[PDB]
Design a protein around this ligand. Structure first.
Ligand SMILES: CS(=O)(=O)c1ccc(-c2noc([C@@H](CC3CC3)[C@H](N)C(F)=C3CCCC3)n2)c(Cl)c1
Ligand SMILES: CS(=O)(=O)c1ccc(-c2noc([C@@H](CC3CC3)[C@H](N)C(F)=C3CCCC3)n2)c(Cl)c1
Ligand SMILES: *[C@@H]1O[C@H](CO)[C@@H](O[C@@H]2O[C@H](CO)[C@@H](O)[C@H](O)[C@H]2NC(C)=O)[C@H](O)[C@H]1NC(C)=O
Ligand SMILES: *[C@@H]1O[C@H](CO)[C@@H](O[C@@H]2O[C@H](CO)[C@@H](O)[C@H](O)[C@H]2NC(C)=O)[C@H](O)[C@H]1NC(C)=O
Ligand SMILES: *[C@@H]1O[C@H](CO)[C@@H](O[C@@H]2O[C@H](CO)[C@@H](O)[C@H](O)[C@H]2NC(C)=O)[C@H](O)[C@H]1NC(C)=O
Ligand SMILES: *[C@@H]1O[C@H](CO)[C@@H](O[C@@H]2O[C@H](CO)[C@@H](O)[C@H](O)[C@H]2NC(C)=O)[C@H](O)[C@H]1NC(C)=O
Ligand SMILES: *[C@@H]1O[C@H](CO)[C@@H](O[C@@H]2O[C@H](CO)[C@@H](O)[C@H](O)[C@H]2NC(C)=O)[C@H](O)[C@H]1NC(C)=O
Ligand SMILES: *[C@@H]1O[C@H](CO)[C@@H](O[C@@H]2O[C@H](CO)[C@@H](O)[C@H](O)[C@H]2NC(C)=O)[C@H](O)[C@H]1NC(C)=O
Ligand SMILES: *[C@@H]1O[C@H](CO)[C@@H](O[C@H]2O[C@H](CO)[C@@H](O)[C@H](O)[C@H]2NC(C)=O)[C@H](O)[C@H]1NC(C)=O
Ligand SMILES: *[C@@H]1O[C@H](CO)[C@@H](O[C@H]2O[C@H](CO)[C@@H](O)[C@H](O)[C@H]2NC(C)=O)[C@H](O)[C@H]1NC(C)=O
Ligand SMILES: *[C@H]1O[C@H](CO)[C@@H](O[C@@H]2O[C@H](CO)[C@@H](O)[C@H](O)[C@H]2NC(C)=O)[C@H](O)[C@H]1NC(C)=O
Ligand SMILES: *[C@@H]1O[C@H](CO)[C@@H](O)[C@H](O)[C@H]1NC(C)=O
Ligand SMILES: *[C@@H]1O[C@H](CO)[C@@H](O)[C@H](O)[C@H]1NC(C)=O
Ligand SMILES: *[C@@H]1O[C@H](CO)[C@@H](O)[C@H](O)[C@H]1NC(C)=O
Ligand SMILES: *[C@@H]1O[C@H](CO)[C@@H](O)[C@H](O)[C@H]1NC(C)=O
Ligand SMILES: *[C@@H]1O[C@H](CO)[C@@H](O)[C@H](O)[C@H]1NC(C)=O
Ligand SMILES: *[C@@H]1O[C@H](CO)[C@@H](O)[C@H](O)[C@H]1NC(C)=O
Ligand code: NA
Lengths: 728, 728
């Protein structure tokens, strides 16, 4: 009898998914890490050579965390002493190695504790942030030029984001953007002077006698937000003037009237940059297109080139206004926007004309624009077979929009339905990455004829291994509610027999624009639960979910904690009505937003669920950050949406928890969803005399991803689920 | 057929013990609150009168928390707006009512947020502390005189103790001491300038958007300690024109050579005060006796009147040097000190003589000196029947030490074996308070011939109720370990049948000088466990325990976490050998020091315990405060006792928890044993992959005593124990 996929298999990663991460260094070459060393591959023929021997830095005296080659291939940036901060931010040390002279630069070294470093897009200039100030080095071994002097820990951030901009606006720590050929360096400056601080203890190693209090500028809903300014400096003038002038580009009058955000920075040409601003009430956005004025050394944004993007049904963009993709001459651009039917499609804009032209349309959506050449635009969409959970690459002819070719749909339709892509520098080649429903498959293709060049990694080794394992199956389908299709997926135990009643676990997230039902292949906790414990693990995408139009996504506008919670309950009823579910054993669990929904569902009094697990849940929206929360909830004030803010808390439903078994878990060093959120849930439960299970994870953050904690939480959760389902 | 004592009975206080808390106001009368009416009783005849009507303040507009009548009966201090701080400290608002003119004083009233207030010992002067400074009021309606001007939150404390002195030295917030007739007001001043602060989050009500960070000067083991100064001010010569002049009494040179503490202040006469100082290495203490000089107006402390107290086997005193009891003329005093055999007995001192004479002796100990007259000294001891867990009142003839009379031993030997006492002003009368083994019994007595005047409260009402309940019994006995007898107690289920096998829960504290095996009658969680769940609850006093001499108490000197932990395992091992114990179901639980021992036991690898619960445990001594920790452990420096500090942590034993079920609980706002201690235990268990149960209590402190949290913790622990023992 074949073994099953056990908890230990998951926690010990015995069945490893292989991938193929390459880094394009030009239009026909990419770097690949093999046998600890770095190889350089010729895309056209597949032949390679050693770029950097694995023994090159054996006497470096430091474990290299990552590397980065300068655009011109003359230098390599070595990163070590890596110290993680938030989701994207971290600090590290850096050394620059001269590839030609094959030596390690020892003079004018990048400072230790550098917050961010980046090569110019061409050549080998460097810009880095240290102590919250920007510095530029024209040459790796020469002194750097300081660009800002206002940097101040936790107060003024130049070239880097503060907590909320990192997490909710830029999805990145860096806040600097080199112009195309590297002459200009643009950057943002954030001022958190009046932003309140979240404070929590960090215990550290046992040796630390007094706990440390971590303090970070974090604006909760309705609180004082950081303010922002934008500047551009001409780096080519640095060696000619004592102190190069940072020219400020001010936000438009429509934004200055109130609180706002800088939400996108995109260079169009060597002397043209585009900026998008968003009002704190996120349903109004403005894009300025600014040109350099060689006679005044200033930047001017003509109102005739300003574009407005607003929404009457919700917020602007999936999570923020989309980025523009400019044609070479910078006189036009393509951008994903919601059409009149509420579906996100590609619109073609002339920079000085306010009306755009949609080049795609249909009851499906464009996920992202991947590359633009003089003749073709490549994008990913979920058009294929009307499956919102699938992803494919398409190519559209710019001289004839009726000519759209799907480049990935038919490559291997049974094994591959979810693709992402990586183009070379000038889009001459592209790597396709299939992630499901079958085992991931990585392939290389030539753009000139769209012919497949070869298979990079097919995961044959893993396929061989899984053959001797009783793996579960996955079903992706939909149910019709109110004349609208809503998709779900189910991880089914091996030898699934529809004539039997299986216990069911609803795996939920359900936040705005989320998608938990898709064609991706995963090896996770649900895999073990279905394979070894014979539990059906389901997920449902209801109102508020993404990639299916604004009608479904904006259904929860200003009303978080309502329809997305209710639809999760309704989904459980629908599943039980399918006949193979044991109504006495229906549980629910989720992490983060999923923790919130789980908690709201368990406290609804529905009677449908027996038990549930909430990990790092939100419990009241006023405790979460402003940028994310206000996007969907507006402001927590009596004149705006305070009433719904107060009505959608987990705490107000404490009394209903007497009807269920609950396990609440939270990391004490969660800088994102503060431990405070679960601290208030537990106190409310204690106040109404409700017994429940709890677990805090010392010094773990929102991901509770440290190796030991990860193994510990899933083990603890498994025992809880097995007990609730009366499983041996 | 009849009901048992249930968990609800314990949590809802269904069966309440009646008390009789009286307040002696003279040598013949006492105050007693009845029906919200303060009555005055005549001890000789038992007749009473109403002293203050419950309706006297029906329109006061504030809920009175407590009252305090001036010594002369002319005024009554009304306490309201009570806000608790630490174990003894709190702030409140006060109003003074004139009992003669039946009027509430409205002029020059005590400020709100007053930290401490106290009437002079005679008359009606008042002294209070506000904003860390001392004020004196000669008359209730007159302006107060400012005594100190250096008070500063968390830095300089005048007349009140800082955190560590409140908790570990004075067991009080007050640091003010009126002379016998109220002429002088002595006070201490604490300086915490360089004492590090413990910081932790306080979440508050749900409405608080950002958690608050509480910061308390708290010296952990080996850290910088607060410094102290002592002053005496003449309150009869205060000037409304000039600032009061405080006279300082400096500590002796043998103390000034390094860190030290002020540990006792006791007035001897109207013009003589005694102070005891303790070195930071708590095995050397010095008592100074100081006399006021009318000429120079200074206080002089003759070296000839100095008394040294040291210990070679441990620290000085049970928790600190004992207090002296001076004779009327103040020329000699009695004090409890450890004799040559290591037993605490009463020594008689001459103020100018170095050698003191022991007036009691034997293999038992004097617990405390209760009253002193020219002919007799009254004291409580555990001499009777050689039972260290019993307490009786004795009097010894001062002119012939061979004449010792037990005054409570034979009153009712079956019902009463544990007494405390309260004497009237000149010891003319005394109230005896019997607290076990039968129901509490309060009686009043006359000293001249030790007549038993009357029964004040006999709890006959509770006795009637308990008749219809299957109550557990209590067995108190001993076992021998190396020629030494160690006592234990067992709470046995109703209808105990020695032929049956019962599961057993070891209830432990085991800190230095602790006593968990005694003759006290208690209605607690253990009562329910024995009565309703049929669980035997045992407690054992091993090495390190008190009231049995230094050989036993000092056995753990510089070695916490060793013998007291090993002796609990040994006792359990022996209990398991008994025919009525199910060796497969033995558990252990403890709170505070008991949580530490419970954890150390469960991590010992003994295999004797199936499960255990630790509530607010200490986990490593370097995290606990200096005064208590160093008393037993010396300093955590390599030259002193660092190795043992590092060997006695719970964390180093994590691996051994793999074979036991463990439940770890802790309040997040514990200012005493910081949450940090449990946060490090959990992290260590996670680190070695051991599963366990946990529960944090939001905003609860060391007592986890708020009404809802109290019910919730005991409910949660009951489920855990029943589960561990497989009980319905
Ligand atoms: C359905 S799922 O694949 O598990 C999934 C998981 C996470 C998200 C997600 N949505 O916002 C965010 C984060 C934004 C990042 C920039 C993306 C967001 N800041 C966050 F962590 C939250 C936790 C509780 C409330 C919001 N993550 C989404 Cl939409 C979907
Ligand atoms: C045996 S028992 O009745 O449960 C019991 C309970 C408490 C104590 C006790 N010993 O020190 C203390 C406290 C001192 C106060 C002045 C009394 C002490 N500061 C404390 F809270 C500790 C908690 C962990 C380490 C010590 N309490 C003792 Cl000796 C015995
Ligand atoms: C892949 O193989 C080709 C064929 O040998 C290599 O092509 C060389 O290309 C350079 C131009 O950069 C010519 O000067 C040479 O004539 C070619 N090689 C030889 C030996 O003549 C190519 O360098 C290889 N690429 C990698 C990454 O190994
Ligand atoms: C960051 O913003 C703060 C405003 O909150 C600025 O501080 C003010 O600066 C002005 C001008 O000097 C002073 O008059 C005010 O007293 C300051 N207010 C506060 C609250 O500090 C600060 O100058 C800004 N910093 C930068 C680099 O822009
Ligand atoms: C380089 O130029 C900048 C801009 O003028 C200088 O920054 C200003 O410094 C003055 C005084 O130090 C402040 O009052 C201004 O608030 C600063 N403005 C900005 C935008 O930062 C900077 O000091 C100059 N550096 C040197 C070395 O001269
Ligand atoms: C990168 O682009 C910049 C901006 O267009 C170029 O700099 C300009 O060069 C022209 C000459 O072609 C001059 O007339 C302008 O004065 C320059 N402008 C500025 C702001 O410097 C630059 O030459 C380009 N770099 C490269 C390597 O081609
Ligand atoms: C409390 O005791 C003090 C000190 O013995 C008394 O004050 C002394 O009283 C005598 C006689 O009246 C004076 O000659 C001394 O000069 C006083 N000494 C001081 C330091 O004041 C005081 O009278 C007593 N108070 C009461 C109420 O008995
Ligand atoms: C009080 O206790 C201290 C500490 O145990 C004793 O001081 C010394 O302690 C060190 C260890 O820290 C030993 O090596 C010494 O032998 C101890 N004595 C001396 C003189 O250094 C001290 O002896 C104790 N005092 C009394 C009166 O017993
Ligand atoms: C207790 O009863 C006695 C009488 O036996 C009361 O009497 C004493 O005090 C009265 C007022 O203070 C006087 O009027 C009596 O003369 C006096 N009697 C004696 C023998 O001295 C006494 O007040 C009562 N005490 C209380 C508190 O009620
Ligand atoms: C409280 O104690 C501090 C020392 O901890 C006293 O200040 C002293 O220490 C300072 C460091 O914080 C030094 O800078 C000062 O020179 C020193 N003070 C003097 C007079 O030299 C402080 O004065 C104390 N406060 C009181 C009221 O005694
Ligand atoms: C301490 O606080 C109380 C309550 O505020 C003060 O009493 C007055 O309270 C009324 C309303 O209850 C207010 O209008 C007054 O402002 C308060 N003060 C006065 C003088 O009336 C009380 O006075 C305060 N105590 C002290 C010493 O200031
Ligand atoms: C590169 O180094 C690895 C280990 O550091 C070694 O196994 C391998 O042999 C080296 N590469 C080649 C091509 O030999
Ligand atoms: C970085 O820090 C290391 C260790 O402190 C030191 O040896 C090195 O010189 C530093 N380098 C720079 C550029 O500061
Ligand atoms: C933006 O949102 C606010 C709040 O709902 C609303 O009052 C305003 O009319 C909206 N603007 C647009 C263009 O929809
Ligand atoms: C005082 O009020 C209480 C109510 O708590 C009442 O029981 C008592 O009878 C009252 N006192 C008198 C003398 O009636
Ligand atoms: C008393 O001392 C304080 C503090 O130095 C001072 O402010 C005040 O004026 C003094 N009062 C008199 C009467 O000297
Ligand atoms: C005596 O008993 C104690 C425990 O009571 C034990 O630690 C010790 O080893 C025994 N032997 C001696 C000589 O003390
Ligand atoms: Na009597």
């Amino acid at each position: 009898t074949r073994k099953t996929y056990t908890l230990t298999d998951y926690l010990k990663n015995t069945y490893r998914l292989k991938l193929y991460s390459l880094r394009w260094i030009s239009d026909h070459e990419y770097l690949y890490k093999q046998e600890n060393n770095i190889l350089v591959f010729n895309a056209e023929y597949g032949n390679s050579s050693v770029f950097l021997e694995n023994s090159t830095f054996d006497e470096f005296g430091h474990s290299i965390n990552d590397y980065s080659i300068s655009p011109d291939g003359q230098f390599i940036l070595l990163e070590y002493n890596y110290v993680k901060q938030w989701r994207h931010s971290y600090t590290a040390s850096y050394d620059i190695y001269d590839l030609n002279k094959r030596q390690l630069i020892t003079e004018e070294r990048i400072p230790n504790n550098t917050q961010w470093v980046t090569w110019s897009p061409v050549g080998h200039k460097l810009a880095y942030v240290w102590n919250n100030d920007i510095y530029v080095k024209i040459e790796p071994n020469l002194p750097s030029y300081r660009i800002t002097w206002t940097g101040k820990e936790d107060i003024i951030y130049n070239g880097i984001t503060d907590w909320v901009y990192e997490e909710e606006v830029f999805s990145a720590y860096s806040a600097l953007w080199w112009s195309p050929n590297g002459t200009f360096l643009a950057y943002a400056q954030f001022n958190d002077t009046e932003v309140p601080l979240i404070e929590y203890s960090f215990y550290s190693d046992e040796s630390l006698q007094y706990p440390k209090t971590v303090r970070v500028p974090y604006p909760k809903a309705g609180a004082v937000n950081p303010t922002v300014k934008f500047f551009v400096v001409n780096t080519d003038s640095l060696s000619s003037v004592t102190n190069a002038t940072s020219i400020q580009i001010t936000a438009p009058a429509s934004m200055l009237i109130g609180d706002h955000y800088l939400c996108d920075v995109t260079w169009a040409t060597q002397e043209r940059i585009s900026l998008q601003w968003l009002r704190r009430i996120q349903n109004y956005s403005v894009m300025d297109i600014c040109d350099y004025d060689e006679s005044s050394g200033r930047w001017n944004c003509l109102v005739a080139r300003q574009h407005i993007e607003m929404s009457t049904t919700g917020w602007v963009g999936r999570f923020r206004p989309s980025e523009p993709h400019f044609t070479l001459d910078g006189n036009s651009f393509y951008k994903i926007i919601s059409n009149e039917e509420g579906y996100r499609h590609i619109c073609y804009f002339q920079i000085d004309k306010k009306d755009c032209t949609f080049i795609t349309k249909g009851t499906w959506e464009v996920i992202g624009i991947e590359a633009l050449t003089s003749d073709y635009l490549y994008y990913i969409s979920n058009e294929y077979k009307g499956m919102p959970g699938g992803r494919n690459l398409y190519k559209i002819q710019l001289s004839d929009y009726t000519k759209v070719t799907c480049l990935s749909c038919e490559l291997n339709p049974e094994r591959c339905q979810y693709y992402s892509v990586s183009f070379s520098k000038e889009a001459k080649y592209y790597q396709l990455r299939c992630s499901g429903p079958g085992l991931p498959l990585y392939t290389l293709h030539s753009s000139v004829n769209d012919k497949g060049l070869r298979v990079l990694e097919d995961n044959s080794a893993l396929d061989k291994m899984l053959q001797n394992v009783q793996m579960p199956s996955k079903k992706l389908d939909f149910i019709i509610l109110n004349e609208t299709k809503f998709w779900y997926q189910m991880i089914l135990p091996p030898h699934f027999d529809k004539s039997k009643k299986y216990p069911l676990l609803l795996d939920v997230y359900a936040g705005p624009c989320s998608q938990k039902a898709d064609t991706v292949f995963r090896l996770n906790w649900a895999t073990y639960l279905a394979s070894t414990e014979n539990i059906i693990v389901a997920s449902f995408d209801g109102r508020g979910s993404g990639y299916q139009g604004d009608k479904i996504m904006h259904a929860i506008n200003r009303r978080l904690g309502t329809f997305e919670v209710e639809d999760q309950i309704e989904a459980a009823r629908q599943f039980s009505k399918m006949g193979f579910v044991d109504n006495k054993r229906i549980a629910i669990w989720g992490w983060s937003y999923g923790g919130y929904v789980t908690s709201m569902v368990l406290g609804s009094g529905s009677g449908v669920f027996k038990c549930g697990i909430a990990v790092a849940p939100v419990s009241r929206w006023e405790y979460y950050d402003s940028v994310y929360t206000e996007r969907y909830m507006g402001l927590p004030t009596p004149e705006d949406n305070l009433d719904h803010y107060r009505n959608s808390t987990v705490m107000s439903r404490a009394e209903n928890f007497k009807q269920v078994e609950y396990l609440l878990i939270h990391g004490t060093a969660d800088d994102n969803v503060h431990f405070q959120q679960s601290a208030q849930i537990s106190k409310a439960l204690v106040d109404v005399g409700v017994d429940f299970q709890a677990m805090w994870y010392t010094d773990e953050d929102h991901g509770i991803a440290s190796s030991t904690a990860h193994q510990h939480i899933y083990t603890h959760m498994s025992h809880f689920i097995k007990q609730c389902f009366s499983l041996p």
